[PDB]
């Protein structure tokens, strides 16, 4: 069974059992949201960090293909002979 | 009770009556050998060690850039 | 009284020997001998010696008690005892400005 | 102040809490620190032993303390011992901590005014503790705001609470250790009377049998002066530069001694 | 939903049964007793009393195990209690 | 002033008006009423506080005498300390920190 | 000195195993019985210990 | 991305604590364990890019506290130890998340318990990504918060009241130590960002490395719960299961572990410290595997097994061997988990019974949980091979390895843990699955055999086993305890690896004991442990269901009786505490507002100057009879005493005393 409980208690976290009826599309513009925020985190630390080594050309690191610092350093490096 | 109207509380007496005993209690006060030798410790005796002891060991220690071949101790 | 102490003080024998005989088959064996106990006894009618026998076995129970004796979850002092209690008045409050 | 600060209507609360205490911390950086430099530094023991005295009794016996508003009131004389002595530091930081953790105060002893002198007391009429239990049931709003402002007077990180807290604890303890390490104590017992006095109203139990009719949840006034209130100490708690960089050169000026190979230059 | 009132009988019903003390397995029933319909002596009880707070997993207290001299009042008893599993 | 009992001696099973707080409404309380309910600490009711003190230290006292016999008989190193050219000086942070095992004293 | 109840410590130990005859007997029978007795409860103490015994075999040629 | 480990789990999070009405329950579990499976696949990404390759990510975004010298960032270092340490405390968050959404299915508030999931793992994040002390600080207290709230999340109940307040108070007693330490490491050093600590610590005053030495391990053994301040850990059992194995056995745990492994570069120039951290990780592997073996219940059994665990890292440490503290920290994490998660499985299929004593059987009615709960305690008891093998076993020679007394001491004491580790290993698994049914009918009765005429289609509750989302973790938390160790441990441990060379860890040569380790321990001592583990569980299986009354003869000796309680009871140590700390401080406070404040402050204050001043009033004001021959004398005699002062020449002093003396008498009445 479930535990009774007062429906006039206004709570943000829900409640009891709490589920709307429209819970999917709430959690769709969420996640979207989450999204939109996790992406410009993203954009602040593909700029802003930092490192002293780059990675071997032939190894695997994915970093490689947003990191501003090692993709200048692969983009002036392709530059001999 | 208290100028706007507050929500209806089974007030118990006896906790009411505690609550007063709280708020009166100076009025009962008196010197006993008890009472004496508890104030007395609380207001001379420990303030007057924390006293002393934050006075004897006034500018006795700095830490500051302190490398090996050195001492804490400044005084 | 003197009835209901002595009923009291069987079930809390029994269940103190199981608490620290976890095996029931080994606790069979010692429940039958602490009934057998209270038997020895039933003929006695003497006020002034009933009690003096209710006194040694509350001491005996406390020389022998179980440093963390079993509980039903939802007993008190159980695992589960007040997990989730309900609100105690499900009335709306009444129309207060505040 | 135990009777003034409980006794008083709740406007008035706030303002004896949040800006009258205030008042002597900011006469000690006019009055003390650059006209009595000689005599501040040779008397620091006695300020110290008795700030450290305060932070000690003063934690004990909020402890103690039955009313919900005199244990608000009690913990305030426990943070003003740790600003006092962080005002005696002759530090930088723990006079910069001094001026931040009175002001930290001033938000969270405003918001915990109003939390027992402004809606338990409108609700129930009593300021008892022992006829409070489980609100969390039914006040959810009030217990996060309540629970978020008794993490501010333990000192919790971010909020300025700790920022204060922890400046004006490494000059005091800078200055003289043993007053530092007695007064690092309020870590622990701030926590004690914060967390025991958060646990006995929003928990312990269900919703407490003395209450007769149910309670409403905060009003959206009770609401947006404990969301504002809670709003500045954690912004400040996150980023203390807003009020650090506009102290950092005035309060220099305060400051007594010097470096041997840094002073009298030619 | 929750405790069926067949269930607590059949469950209790077993549980007498396999009581060597009980006269007859014949003369349990809803509305049995312990002290003339089935035989049971003071100890006996205290013994039932303990296997039906055993086999519903409750601690029944001692002022309420007095009550319980017949198998209705049993039943009624884990009716009553929520916690019964 | 009641008797100056802790709340969780008295009968869970009793009918309270309080189950939670095993206290009837209007019941005559302490002056530690605060520090005498069910939220508060606990009180263990094992053994008196003398016999604890002595079955702790018979645990301390079992404990040092196991490493009493170990101090007797535990052996001796069974290899020569390792040895580094230069003391490892340099790159341990030079004469200013601490350096490694080189043609020492014996140990 | 025997006690004024009939209680003696040595013989509740020597009553401790389980009774040639006991009132709640059949009641409790079950928890020994086919499900529960020695074999079947430790049958698979070690569960996949069987098969992974032949395949190590045929591993080993 | 690294970044985005960072913020992933805080956000989800939010979404669930302050929006769980616009999502609900479903919405909030997608979000949040979306959230941090996310997470967790970048910390794998990021395991590799940091780890193998050996390249530490700096990241500075605004500065936190910046005064004259203290310039504290919101700042983030990864290095080798920062993606070891992420490794289990985000793959288990992900399978504790999932395991939730199957084991609090009828709770009433999953939305806030989904969100205290989420916001416990960005602390702990913030714990290891921190690059300085008071931003690690942030996540120390961060998970402190996160721990209260979890284990009083059934809040109505006042047992659960009491533990939270046990955890956040005992652990604020080591944040106060770890306060005064980053206060010495800001006096001697000007900041505590780790590169500065770290690039000065061989040249600072030895004295000052022993006091933030200590003052850091006091603090690590409140958050790791050593036998000083461990009383908290037992009691954090009250939460919901899954807070014990992800919070109180796999990673908050082992934030202390990581604080002394992180400061390895500066405590690695104490030996003092170090010796200390030696002892007391022995001390705690002994005194928490003896408690164990006299717990009735399963949960409490498991967290006495961890405090176990977590004394044979800080033991580790106190050898030098940070690397093989890190290695047993991340294998433990892994095990642990499956042992609290297969214990969750049991508590569910029995109706929340936790007591072994109504255990049984089992064996048949829950194969998978059986399964998994025995691959957990051979890699626990460090069966060869297991994955716990290649981590304990390791410490144990190299605690020999470290030919010295203190090193053979710890080798015997954690020696005998081990013996008693084996012992409460084997009493969970035979009292919950192999001895005969303890517990009643319900739990065992099926529906294959008749027993019901009408209430046949239901009314059976035989105790199966739990769903996908309850099972799943299981099985995965299995394969990791099995070849995990194995498959990592060249990177832990190797010979001459060069894994943490970013100076994650620092071990000075000077303290290197591994050569002896692999090549001058003897070959008895090295397998010792196996012989010890074999024969005792053969021990204790024969004692019980083939004697079974041996022990019974020991419980009921006095002196059995009396070492059964003494263990069980904990040392005494929660008795002591209360009666003497605790206690001891309620009636302080008892005195300080009944005889000082609302007493002799007041006597020798306010209200005894109004008893004496409205007397001393009422008493003058009783000379003014208005009777016009009396105020004639008193004008004579006031002309006479001035006439008197001024003709003698009298001492002023003389005048005074005259003054208080008749004060004196107006103070007496009549
Ligand atoms: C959590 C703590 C964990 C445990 C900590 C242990 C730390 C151990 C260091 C203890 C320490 C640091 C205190 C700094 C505190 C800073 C703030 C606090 C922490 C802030 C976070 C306190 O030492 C002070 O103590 C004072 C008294 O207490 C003494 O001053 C006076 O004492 C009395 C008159 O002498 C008066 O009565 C008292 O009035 C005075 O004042 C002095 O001894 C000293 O000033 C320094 O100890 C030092 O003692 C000296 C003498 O041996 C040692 O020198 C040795 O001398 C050679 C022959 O002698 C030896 O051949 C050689 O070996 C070595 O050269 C040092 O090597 C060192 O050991
Ligand atoms: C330090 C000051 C605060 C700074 C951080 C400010 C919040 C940042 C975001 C935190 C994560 C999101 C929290 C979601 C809220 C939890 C669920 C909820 O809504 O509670 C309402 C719930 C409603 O729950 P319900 O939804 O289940 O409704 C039914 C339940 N009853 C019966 C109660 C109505 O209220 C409660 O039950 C608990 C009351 C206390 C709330 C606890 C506070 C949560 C936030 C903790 C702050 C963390 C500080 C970090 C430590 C500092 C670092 C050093
Ligand atoms: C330094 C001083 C530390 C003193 C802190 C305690 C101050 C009093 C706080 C009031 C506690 C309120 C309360 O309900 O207590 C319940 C709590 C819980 O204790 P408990 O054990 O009685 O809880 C009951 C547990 N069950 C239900 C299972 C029986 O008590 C405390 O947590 C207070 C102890 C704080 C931590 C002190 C650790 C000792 C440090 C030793 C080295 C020094
Ligand atoms: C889930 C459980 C995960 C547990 C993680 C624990 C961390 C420690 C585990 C240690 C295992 C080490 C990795 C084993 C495989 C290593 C490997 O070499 O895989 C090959 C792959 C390709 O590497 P590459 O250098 O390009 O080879 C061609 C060179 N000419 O190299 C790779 O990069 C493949 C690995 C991809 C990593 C991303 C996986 C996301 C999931
Ligand atoms: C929450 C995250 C808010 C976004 C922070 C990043 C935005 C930014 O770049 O501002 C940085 C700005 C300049 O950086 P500064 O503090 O002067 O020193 C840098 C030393 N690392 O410094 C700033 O102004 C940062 C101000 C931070 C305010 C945070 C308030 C949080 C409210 C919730
Ligand atoms: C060496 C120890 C040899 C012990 C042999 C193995 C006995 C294991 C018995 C057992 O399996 O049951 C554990 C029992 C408590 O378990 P429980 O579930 O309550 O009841 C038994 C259920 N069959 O446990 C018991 O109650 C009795 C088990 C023996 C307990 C005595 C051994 C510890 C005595 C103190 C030794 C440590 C102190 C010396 C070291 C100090 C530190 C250096
Ligand atoms: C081993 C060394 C023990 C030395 C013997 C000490 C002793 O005499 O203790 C006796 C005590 C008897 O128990 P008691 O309850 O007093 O008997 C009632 C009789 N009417 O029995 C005890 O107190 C035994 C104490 C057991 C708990 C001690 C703490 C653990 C010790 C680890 C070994
Ligand atoms: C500052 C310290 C004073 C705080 C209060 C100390 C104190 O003990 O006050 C109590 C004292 C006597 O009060 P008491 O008469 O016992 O109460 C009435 C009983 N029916 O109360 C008194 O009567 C004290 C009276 C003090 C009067 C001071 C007068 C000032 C004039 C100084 C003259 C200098 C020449
Ligand atoms: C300040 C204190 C002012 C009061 C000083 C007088 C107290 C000494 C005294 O006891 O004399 C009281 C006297 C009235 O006489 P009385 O003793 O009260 O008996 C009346 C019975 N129907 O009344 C008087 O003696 C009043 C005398 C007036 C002279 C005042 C002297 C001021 C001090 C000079 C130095
Ligand atoms: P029904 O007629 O069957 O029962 C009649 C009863 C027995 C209820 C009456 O009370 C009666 O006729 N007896 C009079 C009261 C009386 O004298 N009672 C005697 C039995 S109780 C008693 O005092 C003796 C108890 C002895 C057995 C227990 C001893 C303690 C054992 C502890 C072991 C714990 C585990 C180690």
């Given at each position: 069974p479930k535990i009774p409980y007062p429906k006039h208690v206004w709570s943000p976290a829900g409640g009891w059992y709490a589920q709307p009826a429209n819970w999917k599309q709430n959690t769709a513009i969420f996640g979207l949201v989450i999204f939109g925020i996790t992406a410009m985190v993203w954009k602040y630390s593909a700029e802003h960090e930092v490192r002293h080594k780059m990675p071997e050309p032939d190894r695997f690191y994915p970093s490689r293909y947003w990191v501003k610092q090692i993709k200048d350093y692969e983009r002036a490096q392709k530059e001999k002979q | 009770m208290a100028g706007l109207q507050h929500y209806k509380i089974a007030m118990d007496p006896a906790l009411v009556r505690l609550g007063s005993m709280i708020s009166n209690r100076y009025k009962y006060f008196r010197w006993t050998k008890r009472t004496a030798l508890v104030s007395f410790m609380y207001v001379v005796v420990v303030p007057s060690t924390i006293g002393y002891l934050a006075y004897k060991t006034d500018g006795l220690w700095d830490l500051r850039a302190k490398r090996r071949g050195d001492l804490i101790s400044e005084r | 009284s003197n009835r209901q102490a002595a009923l009291s003080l069987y079930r809390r024998a029994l269940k103190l020997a199981l608490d620290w005989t976890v095996h029931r088959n080994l606790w069979r064996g010692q429940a039958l001998y602490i009934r057998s106990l209270f038997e020895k006894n039933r003929n006695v009618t003497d006020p002034r010696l009933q009690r003096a026998l209710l006194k040694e076995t509350e001491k005996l129970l406390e020389k022998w008690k179980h440093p963390d004796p079993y509980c039903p979850p939802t007993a008190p002092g159980g695992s589960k005892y007040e997990r989730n209690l309900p609100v105690p008045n499900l009335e709306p409050p009444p129309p207060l400005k505040f | 102040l135990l009777r003034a600060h409980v006794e008083s209507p709740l406007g008035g609360s706030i303002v004896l809490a949040a800006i009258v205490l205030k008042l002597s911390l900011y006469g000690v950086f006019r009055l003390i620190l650059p006209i009595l430099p000689q005599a501040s530094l040779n008397l620091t023991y006695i300020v110290y032993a008795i700030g450290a005295i305060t932070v000690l009794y003063a934690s004990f016996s909020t402890l103690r303390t039955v009313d919900v508003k005199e244990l608000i009131a009690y913990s305030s004389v426990a943070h003003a011992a740790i600003y006092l002595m962080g005002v005696f530091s002759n530090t930088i930081q723990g006079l910069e901590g001094a001026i931040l953790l009175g002001l930290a105060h001033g938000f969270v002893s405003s918001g915990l005014f109003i939390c027992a002198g402004g809606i338990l007391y409108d609700r129930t009429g009593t300021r008892l503790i022992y006829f409070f239990r489980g609100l969390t049931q039914i006040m959810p709003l009030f217990s996060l705001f309540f629970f978020i402002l008794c993490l501010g007077n333990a000192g919790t990180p971010l909020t300025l609470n700790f920022v204060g807290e922890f400046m004006s604890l490494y000059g005091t303890l800078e200055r003289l250790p043993i007053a530092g390490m007695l007064a690092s104590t309020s870590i622990i017992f701030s926590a004690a009377y914060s967390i025991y006095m958060y646990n006995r109203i929003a928990f312990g139990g269900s919703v407490s049998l003395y209450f007769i009719d149910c309670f409403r949840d905060l009003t959206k006034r009770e609401f947006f002066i404990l969301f504002t209130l809670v709003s500045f100490t954690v912004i400040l708690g996150i980023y203390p530069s807003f009020v650090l960089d506009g102290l950092h050169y005035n309060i220099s000026s305060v400051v007594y001694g010097i470096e041997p190979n840094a002073s009298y230059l030619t | 939903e929750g405790l069926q009132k067949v269930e607590v009988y059949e469950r209790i019903k077993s549980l007498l049964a396999g009581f060597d003390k009980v006269n007859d397995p014949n003369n349990i029933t809803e509305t049995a007793h312990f002290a003339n319909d089935l035989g049971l002596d003071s100890l006996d009880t205290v013994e039932v009393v303990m296997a039906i707070e055993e086999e519903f997993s409750i601690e029944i207290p001692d002022k309420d195990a007095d009550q319980i001299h017949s198998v209705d009042k049993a039943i009624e008893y884990i009716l009553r209690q929520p916690d019964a599993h | 002033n009641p008797p100056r009992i802790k709340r969780q001696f008295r009968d869970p099973h009793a009918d309270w008006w309080d189950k939670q707080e095993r206290r009837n409404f209007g019941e005559p309380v302490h002056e530690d009423h605060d520090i005498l309910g069910m939220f508060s600490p606990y009180e263990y009711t094992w053994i008196t506080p003398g016999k604890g003190l002595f079955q702790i230290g018979l645990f301390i006292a079992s404990f040092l005498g196991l490493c009493y016999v170990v101090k007797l008989t535990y052996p001796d190193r069974v290899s020569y300390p390792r040895e580094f050219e230069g003391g490892l000086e340099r790159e341990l942070g030079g004469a200013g920190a601490v350096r490694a095992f080189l043609c020492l004293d014996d140990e | 000195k025997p006690n004024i109840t009939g209680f003696d410590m040595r013989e509740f130990l020597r009553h401790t195993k389980t009774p040639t005859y006991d009132p709640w007997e059949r009641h409790e029978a079950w928890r020994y019985t086919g499900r529960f007795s020695r074999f079947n409860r430790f049958k698979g103490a070690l569960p996949g210990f069987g098969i992974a015994t032949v395949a190590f075999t045929a591993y080993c040629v | 991305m690294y970044l985005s480990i960072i913020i992933l789990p805080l956000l989800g999070s939010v979404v669930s604590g302050f929006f769980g009405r616009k999502v609900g329950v479903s919405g909030a579990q997608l979000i949040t364990c979306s959230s941090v499976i996310i997470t967790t696949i970048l910390s794998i990404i990021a395991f590799f890019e940091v780890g193998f390759n050996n390249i530490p990510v700096t990241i500075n975004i605004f500065r936190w506290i910046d005064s004259e010298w203290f310039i504290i960032n919101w700042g983030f270092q990864y290095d080798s130890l920062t993606v070891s340490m992420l490794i289990p405390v985000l793959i288990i968050s992900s399978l504790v998340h999932i395991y939730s959404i199957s084991y609090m299915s009828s709770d009433p508030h999953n939305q806030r318990f989904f969100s205290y999931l989420s916001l416990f793992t960005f602390m702990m994040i913030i714990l290891v990504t921190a690059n300085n002390y008071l931003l690690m600080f942030v996540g120390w207290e961060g998970v402190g918060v996160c721990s209260y709230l979890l284990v009083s999340f059934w809040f109505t109940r006042i047992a659960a009241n009491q533990s939270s307040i046990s955890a956040f108070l005992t652990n604020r007693v080591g944040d106060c130590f770890l306060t005064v330490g980053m206060f010495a490491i800001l006096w001697s050093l000007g900041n505590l960002d780790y590169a500065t600590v770290f690039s000065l610590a061989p040249y600072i005053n030895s004295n000052v490395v022993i006091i933030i030495g200590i003052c850091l391990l006091i603090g690590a053994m409140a958050k790791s719960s050593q036998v000083g301040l461990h009383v908290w850990l037992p009691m954090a059992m009250e939460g919901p299961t899954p807070v014990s194995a992800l919070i109180h056995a796999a990673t908050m745990v082992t934030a202390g572990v990581y604080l002394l492994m992180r400061s390895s570069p500066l405590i690695e120039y104490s030996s003092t410290v170090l010796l200390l951290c030696l002892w007391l990780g022995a001390i705690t592997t002994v005194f928490s595997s003896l408690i164990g073996l006299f717990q009735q219940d399963i949960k409490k059994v498991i967290a006495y097994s961890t405090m176990s665990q977590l004394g044979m890292m800080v033991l580790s440490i106190g050898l030098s061997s940070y690397n093989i503290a890190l290695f047993h920290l991340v294998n433990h994490a892994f095990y642990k988990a499956l042992?609290?998660?297969?214990?969750?499985?049991?508590?569910?299929?029995?109706?929340?019974?936790?007591?072994?004593?109504?255990?049984?059987?089992?064996?048949?009615?829950?194969?998978?949980?059986?399964?998994?709960?025995?691959?957990?305690?051979?890699?626990?008891?460090?069966?060869?091979?297991?994955?716990?093998?290649?981590?304990?076993?390791?410490?144990?020679?190299?605690?020999?390895?470290?030919?010295?007394?203190?090193?053979?001491?710890?080798?015997?004491?954690?020696?005998?843990?081990?013996?008693?580790?084996?012992?409460?290993?084997?009493?969970?698994?035979?009292?919950?699955?192999?001895?005969?049914?303890?517990?009643?009918?319900?739990?065992?009765?099926?529906?294959?055999?008749?027993?019901?005429?009408?209430?046949?289609?239901?009314?059976?509750?035989?105790?199966?086993?739990?769903?996908?989302?309850?099972?799943?973790?299981?099985?995965?938390?299995?394969?990791?305890?099995?070849?995990?160790?194995?498959?990592?441990?060249?990177?832990?441990?190797?010979?001459?690896?060069?894994?943490?060379?970013?100076?994650?860890?620092?071990?000075?040569?000077?303290?290197?004991?591994?050569?002896?380790?692999?090549?001058?321990?003897?070959?008895?001592?090295?397998?010792?442990?196996?012989?010890?583990?074999?024969?005792?569980?053969?021990?204790?299986?024969?004692?019980?269901?083939?004697?079974?009354?041996?022990?019974?003869?020991?419980?009921?000796?006095?002196?059995?009786?009396?070492?059964?309680?003494?263990?069980?009871?904990?040392?005494?140590?929660?008795?002591?505490?209360?009666?003497?700390?605790?206690?001891?401080?309620?009636?302080?406070?008892?005195?300080?507002?009944?005889?000082?404040?609302?007493?002799?402050?007041?006597?020798?204050?306010?209200?005894?100057?109004?008893?004496?001043?409205?007397?001393?009033?009422?008493?003058?004001?009783?000379?003014?009879?208005?009777?016009?021959?009396?105020?004639?004398?008193?004008?004579?005699?006031?002309?006479?005493?001035?006439?008197?002062?001024?003709?003698?020449?009298?001492?002023?002093?003389?005048?005074?005393?005259?003054?208080?003396?008749?004060?004196?008498?107006?103070?007496?009445?009549?």
């Open positions: - | - | - | - | - | - | - | 042992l609290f998660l297969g214990a969750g499985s049991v508590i569910h299929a029995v109706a929340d019974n936790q007591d072994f004593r109504k255990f049984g059987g089992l064996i048949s009615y829950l194969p998978l949980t059986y399964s998994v709960m025995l691959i957990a305690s051979l890699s626990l008891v460090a069966f060869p091979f297991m994955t716990g093998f290649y981590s304990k076993d390791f410490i144990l020679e190299s605690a020999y390895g470290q030919f010295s007394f203190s090193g053979v001491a710890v080798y015997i004491i954690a020696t005998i843990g081990a013996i008693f580790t084996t012992l409460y290993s084997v009493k969970v698994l035979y009292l919950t699955f192999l001895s005969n049914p303890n517990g009643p009918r319900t739990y065992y009765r099926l529906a294959i055999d008749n027993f019901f005429s009408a209430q046949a289609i239901k009314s059976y509750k035989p105790a199966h086993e739990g769903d996908f989302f309850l099972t799943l973790p299981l099985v995965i938390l299995a394969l990791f305890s099995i070849f995990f160790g194995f498959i990592t441990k060249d990177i832990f441990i190797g010979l001459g690896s060069n894994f943490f060379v970013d100076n994650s860890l620092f071990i000075h040569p000077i303290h290197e004991i591994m050569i002896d380790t692999e090549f001058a321990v003897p070959v008895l001592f090295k397998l010792l442990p196996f012989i010890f583990t074999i024969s005792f569980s053969v021990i204790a299986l024969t004692l019980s269901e083939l004697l079974s009354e041996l022990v019974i003869y020991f419980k009921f000796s006095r002196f059995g009786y009396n070492i059964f309680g003494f263990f069980n009871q904990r040392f005494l140590i929660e008795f002591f505490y209360n009666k003497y700390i605790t206690n001891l401080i309620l009636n302080l406070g008892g005195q300080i507002t009944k005889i000082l404040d609302k007493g002799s402050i007041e006597l020798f204050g306010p209200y005894g100057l109004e008893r004496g001043l409205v007397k001393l009033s009422k008493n003058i004001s009783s000379l003014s009879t208005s009777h016009v021959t009396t105020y004639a004398l008193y004008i004579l005699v006031g002309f006479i005493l001035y006439l008197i002062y001024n003709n003698l020449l009298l001492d002023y002093s003389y005048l005074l005393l005259i003054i208080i003396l008749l004060l004196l008498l107006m103070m007496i009445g009549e």
